[PDB]
Amino acid sequence: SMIFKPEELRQALMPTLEALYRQDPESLPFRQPVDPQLLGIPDYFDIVKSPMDLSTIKRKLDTGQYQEPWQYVDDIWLMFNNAWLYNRKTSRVYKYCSKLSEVFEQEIDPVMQSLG
């Protein structure tokens, strides 16, 4: 595959991450790691083996931890798939996840075309 530099990935991908943060209120559950003790859900880490959230993805982009853009896409989908796995289909967090995923699909498609 092609080489990607960290600054190039920030320019291309940060707008797609920003679009998720700007979904308000729907991004609020995703702006920080899940805290199962605080949120009253002690089985969370038994169900969700690889936690992920927007702050972690932002830090990885900011510090240059992605070598290529599909690693970023993988982390976004990990975050979404964790929330659809743990939460019931009628719950607020599940519905907010679906909203963010719709926004992401719209934003990421032209960006990955340009990168690829």
Ligand X SMILES: CCc1c(C(=O)N[C@H]2c3cc(Cl)ccc3CC[C@@H]2O)[nH]c(C)c1C(C)=O
Positions in the binding site for ligand X (CB under 6 A): 25, 28-30, 32, 34-35, 38-39, 41, 44, 83, 86-87, 93
Compute the distance between CA of residue 91 and CA of residue 101 in angstroms, rounded to an integer.
16
CB of 107 to ligand X, least distance (A): 20
25 cis-preceded (ω within 30 degrees of 0): yes
CB of 58 to ligand X, least distance (A): 15
DSSP assignment of 19-46: HHHTSTTTTGGGSS---TTTTT-TTHHH
Give 74's contacts (C-beta < 8 A, 6+ positions apart).
none
Residues with their C more than 2.5 Å from the N of the next written residue in the chain, i.e. before a break, are none
